[PDB]
Structure formats: structure tokens, C-alpha cells
Design a protein around this nucleic acid. Sequence first.
DNA 1: ACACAAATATTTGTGT
DNA 2: ACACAAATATTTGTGT
Length: 94
Amino acid sequence: GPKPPYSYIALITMAIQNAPEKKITLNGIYQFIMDRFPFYRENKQGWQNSIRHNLSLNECFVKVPRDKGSYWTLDPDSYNMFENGSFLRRRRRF
DNA sequence: ACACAAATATTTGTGT
DNA sequence: ACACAAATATTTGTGT
Ligand SMILES: [Mg+2]
């Protein structure tokens, strides 16, 4: 149906915070979004590219090696970018 | 969006 | 059958 009101940055931040170890792979981010938001079960090419692009562009998502590919985590300075927990409004940079 | 490299995964080929 | 190497395919990550 309609696309949810959350930005790609909010979606990634939801997935990272939802992981028990606060670290998650890229496919884990795909699965999180598709499980909770049916709009993203279609045309995966497009938005999954936008997910990868948002992971590399924004400093707030830092890549970390494992112990498949790599774990994505939140910079602690940006862990609560969405202060009220609704993920509708994002705090701006210090 | 695009192109593209780098890193992994899968399929195919060869020898025994 | 197996082990293993080559070659391809796919995913992951980065740069305008
Ligand atoms: Mg980044």
C-alpha cells in the first residue's frame, strides 16, 4: 500500500537498535524492513540501493568487521538522533 | 538515480 | 564419489 512515513535513515536506525547486540548486517537491515513494512516487499532493487547509499554517505552509520559481510552500527553521538522514539523527526548535528 | 570496485558466493572445469 | 582450481555470478560498499 502506501509507503510508511519513515526515512531510510530512520529505517536503518530502527534495524540497528532492534538487533540484540546493536550491530546488524546489510541483509539483516533488508529483512527487518520487509518484515514490518509490506510496501518494501516490492521493487527491492530501488530502495535497497538507497539503503546501501545511506549507509555509506551518513557518518552516523559506521561499518565494523565481524568475529557474511560486515556489521553496521550507529555512531554513539547519533544513537538517539530520533529523540522521542517515534522516528518521525531527526535531531540535527551538533 | 548512475557507474563501478571490492568482497563473497556459486557454478563449472579438471584430475584421481 | 572426492578435492581443488578456474571462471562467473551475486552481493556489498563507495563515489559523484
Ligand atoms: Mg557511513
